[PDB]
Design a protein around this nucleic acid. Structure first.
Ligand code: GCP
Lengths: 79, 466
RNA sequence: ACGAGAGGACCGGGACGGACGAACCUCUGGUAUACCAGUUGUCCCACCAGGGGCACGGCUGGAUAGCCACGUUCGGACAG
RNA sequence: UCUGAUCGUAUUGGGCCUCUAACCUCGGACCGUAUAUCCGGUUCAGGGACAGUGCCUGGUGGGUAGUUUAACUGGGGCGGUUGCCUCCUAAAAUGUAACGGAGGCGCCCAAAGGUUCCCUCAACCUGGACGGCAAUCAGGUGUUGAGUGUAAGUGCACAAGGGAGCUUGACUGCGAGACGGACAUGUCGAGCAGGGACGAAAGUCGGGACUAGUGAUCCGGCACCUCUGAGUGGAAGGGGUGUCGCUCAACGGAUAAAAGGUACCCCGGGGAUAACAGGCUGAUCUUCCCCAAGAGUCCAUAUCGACGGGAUGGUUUGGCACCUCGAUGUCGGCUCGUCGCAUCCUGGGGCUGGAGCAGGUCCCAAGGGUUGGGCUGUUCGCCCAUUAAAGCGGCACGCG
RNA sequence: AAAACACAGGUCCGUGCGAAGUCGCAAGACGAUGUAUACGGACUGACGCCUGCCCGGUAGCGAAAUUCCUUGUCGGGUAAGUUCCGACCUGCACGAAUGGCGUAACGACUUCUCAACUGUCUCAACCAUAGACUCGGCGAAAUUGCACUACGAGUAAAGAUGCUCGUUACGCGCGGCAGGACGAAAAGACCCCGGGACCUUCACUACAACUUGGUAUUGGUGC
RNA sequence: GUCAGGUAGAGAAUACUAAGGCGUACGAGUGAACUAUGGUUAAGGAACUCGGCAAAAUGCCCCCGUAACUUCGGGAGAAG
RNA sequence: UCUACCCAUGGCCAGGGUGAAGCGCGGGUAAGACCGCGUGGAGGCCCGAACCCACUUAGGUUGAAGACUGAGGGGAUGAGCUGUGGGUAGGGGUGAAAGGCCAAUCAAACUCCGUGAUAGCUGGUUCUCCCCGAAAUGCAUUUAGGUGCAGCGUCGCAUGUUUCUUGCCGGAGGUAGAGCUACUGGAUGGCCGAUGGGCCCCACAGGGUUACUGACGUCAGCCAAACUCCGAAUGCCGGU
């Protein structure tokens, strides 16, 4: 009389790391995710493990294209 | 072991008096005829007919009885092979290599229910369980399962629970743990002791402490219910009204005979052990003598000794009794075996209660559905047994007449010339009494009624002499 | 009463109880370590006789008082 | 000195058999020695190139010894588990426990990796010998369904899915920037060498749709190196680079190397943790209602009451682990009690299912009483003889 | 204090003699100033019984004394009778071709039934003595956080003299009882955890206890 | 380890005594319960109790007389 | 010097009883085994003191006594008990064997030394005040009542506030709620209308006939934690 369960993997700490409006550096990880829940938008690349990272410096923005959520980087005006 | 204790004479022992295959009677024919919800039963069954202390017909009838029990409890039965031996095995129940052969048979059938008729000991139960890896059919457990599923009243449920616990207590180790594990919800295994749905999750509590506690509680309760039934039957016992008990084998009308002789509507089902509580009802003999006709619980060939409390009501009705209408059906395999089983239980009751054997009116029914093979001495081998067949109304008048003739009257015949200035003394004669040949003369009549005892003392008013 | 019997009362009125308790010692009975008696062994009182010490009061048969129960007497109530 | 036999001299290390001289004899005699079963010497006799004890060497080796024999755990044991991945629990960031609910694993793929290009049916009809739940098939729409190396979020007729070519992104070797997550782990922009695809057309695309498919360090290998080289003209004797060796699966891996018993036990602690009792709870247990279905010869409720439902009590078994482990003595019996009422007499109601009676069933109102034996560890019970009755419980299952 | 050990008898094994086996590193010793009718070790534990077609075959026997027996059934024994005694019992059984059954005698062994006996008991009463008690003398002890230390129902680390609200109770003794002070005593023996010890072993690793090579040691021939 | 009076007695048991040696080191009192050690006990007689625990009982000499079973020795002092 | 065993040399065992072979025979008997009467006095023999022991019970149980006393009890010619003198010594001895005994201690005696052994475990750790002031969590752990690191407490740097509160602004969620014909698992009805069993017309063409097992579909209706066509409030991440 025992339980066949009891196993579980480590939480992978996925999700959005830089939310809308956050100024990021090039190569900064924006979304840790499984698959393309968010798709690489403008100045945003998609990593091998589906990690969306900024390709250029700027502010994180979330948009919608063809009904798919995308993460874009809007260039920030130089001061 | 070529010559060691010469029992293993020919490989499998008893060349033809051992397990064989001739297709037998193949038991009932219960197959998939209504394609709906396969979640119905417990697969197919095979006949293995043991001739021990009996003949081929006896073994076939006994195992058909077992298969009918199984089909009432669930399961399916549509095959027959053969197995015989004149030595109930102490270790196993089917035999030395017959156990492995039965394991192969159950594997080939694809079922966990074939045959293990006869009450077993814990040794036999657990040894056979180890041998075949699955329970098949225990007769005592199966009768108890039928009673558990058919129990309605608190009294019946308590009696059946006590019976199941009495059966479980000696054999709680191997078979006990096996059926504790079992959760399929079948005969015995999660069968329960209640009825519909029932307490299968716990069954007979499969635990020494719980079983003993529950047995003590149910024994106290059954004493209470015996007192309650004593109070309930006190009215009849004090009225001294003629009590007629319908005894007999399971099925074979009985309940139908009650519903026919009276206007009752007691449960009448083709399944076995449909009636678990005796039920009494009014009855009027042809001569007008009122009586109480009581349907009882149905007996079987070897009633498990654990159902003593379940059948105590029926046995008490038999003990009181005044006619013992013995109901049997000619549409069975050798109904004389049914007659003999019921007669032996009746004789056991008579010996236990030390009372004169009350009349026994033998009645046969289902004659309309009988084969009619016997002319007058095979189908009616009995000299003075009544034939009724409740379903199609016939012979019931003869049954009633035999009832009235056999039941001795407690009244006394009188010739009282009640005047016409009394009125009440003659109206009550009509009311409590059996008037016949009353004179129409307005002057002193001569009513030849069979008045009861208290009225028989009011004769000196107008008794005259003749 | 039932008013068929079998069987058989309520309510009232008497007698005798069982258990328990209290008191008491007339009876009965127990005990009895300064009572009386018989008696064994031994040693003494010089000796005999008669006694004593010791042996469970040596033992044994009784045994008033006291204390007791197995004994005696009384009680549980009657009324509001 | 070979294509290179062939015999002979000494040496030579084994095996059989031998005699004596090493060595051995607790076999005899003699002597030291008067004393002497010691000891030694001499001699004879017998082992007599025979056996022996050191050094080396395999093997057996609880005879002895030193030790090990994990943890989690609703006490411990037993069982189960231990690392990684996925989901839910998880309370819309992340993270989140339980011996919570489910599964996977720990591989596989040289064409299932890269690139370039292209696609296209889930189900009715007509049918399509055979060939219906299916063929090779043909049409329509099913509108993005459908299905799709291995469980969630994704990917679709914008295809991460399905086919094809290349010839080997099978993209490898040197890799600013940033980052996400203690070490460990994980993401990629981008620059350079060399290539692969696509080329016209662009100049574009860093193992697998993505998260598991693993094991630190130590110690050892194996290939390469412009390193070292214990004085060196110098070499041999270690390092660097990339790679290999652990079901170290108790998966952060105490040893390269380890199972038990203890009631013969001991010590250090613990009420951090079990057995008794207490405490909470009340599943179980115990005592108590209904639209009453049904039984009770006529009739739900005189007696009962199924299927369901609601509680009491704290006398059972439990659950918990809150006092007590620098000690709270157990079952039974005895003795002595004391209390509750959930009544075994005294008062009533109903049934009069007593039409009635003697009796009895049921439900409402503690002062007293509530026996003695046998068999019982007997907590329980059964039995014998009574009784008006032989009550049930609480009091640390009252009371050592 | 026993049913355990031992024992007389038995069987097996070892030992050919400074034997074997033991105490010792060895010498040496016991064994034994014994020599297979003797010593040592092992295991049984007087004494009696325990073979069936061939012990040429299925092959270890199938009888009996064999009581797990729960064997129920029945009785005997009690009024109720445990231990136990009988027949019927129990089927391949089942456990002993030598480890099972008997066995007179014996036993502070375990269990039971009798006769006798009794204060064990119904059911207790009385007497004496030593204490206890009183006086005089001497004069401790464990224990002790305290103190002019009640009861109830509560509350509280869930069982209160110390807290709450009430109830009761004049102060101080003496002789008694033993319900509580979770009374004293022993840093719980149980249980768990950590450590230890000793014991076992086909746990690990060692070591004590024997073979191989060559040292001691080595000459030829018949070979 | 040695000696071992007398009377009973088989006796070195036991009782009482000779010789000899002691009254041994808290006493005096006191009919409390209760405890201990002794004693007695009506009528029962194991009903007690786990259990006849304890107590009670038998007990010696001489005549008789002694069972089942037995290893022929015993049992046996059977028992009575 | 206790105790276990053994060795040497001494001692003790009151009293009473029973009656083990050879002589003569009645014998048995050819003769023998052997019965009986006498004699003899054996025995791990019997009863029972001393003596040794220690079965029962009561007492003792801060005792008279660190094992005893009273009353009974066992052996008491023997494997007896004892005095004296010896021997065996610790992983050893001795053990008719109980882990028994080896100086009131034994599953490895005692003394001293190593030594102030070690103990993640108990316990104790002594004056004051001022300021601040926790933790009982995470990860790992031969780890779980220990410890390492982190989290959380305590001066000097930067800071003027990066912290925090509020407002507003941008943001991703899939929880609460529901909704399910939006998926994955369900629910009373009738429906063109699936096997249609069943009447059959009597086709084996082909077809109504469906009292009943009831396909897809459809109609308002309902649930879910591992359902989601949706989807807050808060919380969180940034900016202001
Ligand atoms: N053809 C026929 N059938 C009958 C006759 N009597 C009874 N039956 C049928 O047999 C079945 C037996 O059931 P029942 O009448 O209850 O018999 P029973 O004895 O009460 C069954 P139990 O004893 O276990 O309660 C019924 O279903 C009934 O229809 C008869 O005379 N003829």
């Amino acid at each position: 009389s025992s339980s066949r369960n009891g196993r579980d993997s480590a939480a992978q700490r996925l999700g959005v790391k830089r939310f809308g409006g956050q100024v990021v550096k090039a190569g900064e990880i924006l979304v840790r995710q499984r698959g393309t829940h968010f798709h690489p938008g403008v100045n945003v690349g998609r990593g091998g493990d589906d990690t969306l990272f900024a390709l250029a410096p700027g502010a994180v923005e979330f948009g919608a294209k063809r009904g798919r959520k995308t993460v874009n980087i809007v260039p920030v005006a130089r001061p | 072991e070529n010559s060691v204790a010469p029992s293993t004479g020919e490989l499998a022992l008893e060349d033809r008096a051992s397990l064989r295959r001739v297709a037998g009677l193949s038991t009932e024919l219960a197959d998939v005829s209504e394609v709906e919800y396969r979640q119905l039963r417990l697969e197919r069954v095979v006949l293995v007919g043991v001739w021990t202390e009996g003949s081929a017909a006896d073994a076939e009838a006994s195992l058909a009885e077992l298969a009918a029990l199984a089909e009432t409890a669930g399961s399916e039965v549509l095959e027959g092979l053969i197995q015989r031996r004149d030595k109930p095995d102490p270790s196993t129940y089917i035999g030395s290599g017959k156990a492995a052969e039965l394991r192969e048979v159950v594997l080939a059938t694809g079922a966990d229910t074939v045959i293990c008729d006869g009450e077993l000991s814990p040794a036999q139960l657990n040894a056979l369980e180890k041998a075949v890896k699955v329970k098949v059919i225990d007769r005592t457990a199966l009768i108890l399962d039928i009673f558990a599923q058919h129990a309605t009243s608190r009294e019946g449920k308590a009696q059946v629970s006590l019976a199941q616990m009495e059966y479980m207590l000696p054999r709680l180790r191997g078979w006990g743990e096996s059926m504790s594990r079992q959760a399929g919800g079948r005969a015995g295994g999660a069968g329960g002791g209640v009825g519909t749905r029932g307490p299968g999750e716990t069954k007979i509590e499969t635990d020494r402490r719980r079983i003993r506690e529950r047995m003590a509680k149910l024994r106290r309760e059954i004493r209470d219910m015996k007192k309650i039934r004593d109070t309930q039957r006190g009215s009849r016992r004090r009225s001294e009204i003629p009590s007629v008990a319908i005894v007999g084998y399971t099925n074979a009308g009985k309940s139908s005979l009650l519903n026919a002789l009276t206007g009752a509507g007691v449960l009448v089902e083709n399944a076995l052990f449909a009636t678990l509580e005796p039920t009494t009802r009014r009855g009027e003999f042809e001569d007008g003598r009122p009586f109480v006709l009581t349907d009882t619980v149905g007996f079987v060939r070897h009633l498990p000794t654990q159902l003593v409390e379940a059948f105590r009501s029926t046995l008490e009705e038999v003990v009181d009794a005044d006619l013992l209408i013995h109901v049997v059906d000619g549409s069975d395999v050798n109904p004389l075996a049914q007659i003999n089983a019921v007669r032996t239980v009746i004789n056991e009751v008579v010996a236990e209660y030390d009372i004169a054997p009350p009349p026994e009116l033998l009645v046969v029914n289902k004659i309309d559905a009988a084969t009619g093979v016997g002319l007058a001495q095979l189908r009616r081998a009995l000299p003075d047994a009544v034939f009724v067949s409740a379903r199609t109304g016939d012979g019931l008048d003869k049954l009633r007449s035999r009832m009235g003739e056999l039941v001795e009257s407690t009244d006394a015949t009188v010739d009282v010339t009640i005047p016409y200035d009394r009125g009440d003394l003659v109206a009550r004669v009509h009311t409590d009494g059996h008037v016949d040949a009353t004179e129409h003369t307005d002057a002193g009549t001569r009513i030849k009624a069979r008045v009861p005892a208290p009225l028989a003392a009011t004769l000196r008013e107008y008794a005259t002499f003749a």
